[PDB]
Design a protein around this ligand. Sequence first.
Ligand SMILES: COC(=O)N[C@H](C(=O)NN(CCC[C@@]1(O)Cc2ccc(cc2)C/C=C\CNC(=O)[C@H](C(C)C)NC1=O)Cc1ccc([C@H]2C=S=CC2)cc1)C(C)(C)C
Ligand SMILES: [Cl-]
Ligand SMILES: [Cl-]
Ligand SMILES: [Cl-]
Lengths: 99, 99
Amino acid sequence: PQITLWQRPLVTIKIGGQLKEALLDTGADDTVLEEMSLPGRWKPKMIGGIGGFIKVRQYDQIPIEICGHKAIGTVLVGPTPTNVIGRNLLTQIGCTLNF
Amino acid sequence: PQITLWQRPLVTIKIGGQLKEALLDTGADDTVLEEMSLPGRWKPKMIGGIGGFIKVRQYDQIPIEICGHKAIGTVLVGPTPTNVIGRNLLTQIGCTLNF
Ligand SMILES: COC(=O)N[C@H](C(=O)NN(CCC[C@@]1(O)Cc2ccc(cc2)C/C=C\CNC(=O)[C@H](C(C)C)NC1=O)Cc1ccc([C@H]2C=S=CC2)cc1)C(C)(C)C
Ligand SMILES: [Cl-]
Ligand SMILES: [Cl-]
Ligand SMILES: [Cl-]
């Protein structure tokens, strides 16, 4: 699709069998989701946003659908204001910015 | 142009007589720049991201030039850790997401 930006670029993702809404965010290196259960072991990451730093749990090699486009990659989980899909997964689904 | 998301999508903007580098951010409602001077009236605003909120000055109807594209919009100024161009200006230069 071509998504314009008059509204928040909110899409439906699927992860661990469940549908969620997330924000397509080209200003984010990483993908960070609100608290949820994921399988396997996790590593620590500190990520910085506009308001400061938060600790998150890093899960790797997690399958995730993003408006129906299949990706498998690194998902961070922690206290974010919303689910944000970052460049690590945007690149996997062939996203570019165009003007 | 078409802009890849292998790297951070950084562009030069011209604003208030100054050249600055900034991050094209589809996930951002607003445009926020590190501390600088702008002319005319302003009002305080709290904006939120990962980490919490910061207090900024809101200037409206500010001319800006992005990758050679002229627009005019609200610009927020404050202690953001990096310069972000948000949807309020991205729309004006015809910027869309594509995959
Ligand atoms: C490389 O680090 C990152 O990629 N950080 C990422 C990130 O914060 N990058 N930044 C882009 C802005 C992120 C976000 O779009 C993320 C976002 C957060 C909340 C919301 C939407 C989008 C919804 C709630 C309120 C609306 N808030 C906003 O629209 C704000 C804008 C007003 C700034 N939007 C955002 O803050 C800008 C940003 C970049 C770097 C840094 C850091 C550099 S050093 C310490 C921090 C801070 C901010 C992230 C998401 C992984 C934490
Ligand atoms: Cl990844
Ligand atoms: Cl505006
Ligand atoms: Cl349009």
